[PDB]
């Protein structure tokens, strides 16, 4: 099931490190959560709609910010329709869209935006190769 993917392939130990993502999830592109980590933020429906709209119209959240469970992430450079990236002080967020899914990764210090992006894009790219 999808819970296995979050636990074993998102919340895994990051390479050459003891760290791991603060939380993670896998959503459908329709915005229904398929699986999430125990400490995944209590997101609101309109926050997910905004993320869905950002993959349809890139750069829409850039001036105003990306919100998750009330927490604002300063939007940073991302791949249009594919990856959304955000900064919240020390922490951040990486959202990777595939054919049928959206893979969320949320990190904290000392995890880099590149390492969250590695975990999230690696899994996203596997699900793309498997035809999803």
């Amino acid at each position: 099931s999808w819970q296995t993917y979050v636990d074993e392939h998102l919340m895994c130990d990051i390479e050459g490190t003891g760290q791991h993502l603060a939380s993670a999830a896998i959503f459908g592109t329709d915005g229904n959560v398929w699986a999430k980590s125990s400490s995944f933020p209590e997101f609101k429906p309109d926050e997910i709609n905004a993320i869905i709209k950002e993959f349809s119209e890139p750069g829409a959240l850039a001036p105003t910010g990306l919100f998750l469970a009330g927490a604002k992430y300063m939007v940073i450079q991302g791949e249009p329709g594919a990856v959304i990236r955000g900064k919240k002080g020390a922490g951040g967020i990486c959202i990777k869209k595939t054919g049928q899914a959206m893979v969320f990764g949320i990190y904290e210090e000392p995890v880099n935006p590149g390492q969250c992006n590695m975990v999230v894009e690696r899994l996203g790219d596997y699900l793309v190769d498997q035809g999803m």
Partner: peptide, 10 residues
């Protein structure tokens, strides 16, 4: 519904 996940990667 969520579609079935593919086989776990190596």
């Amino acid at each position: 519904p969520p579609p079935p996940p593919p086989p776990p990667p190596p």
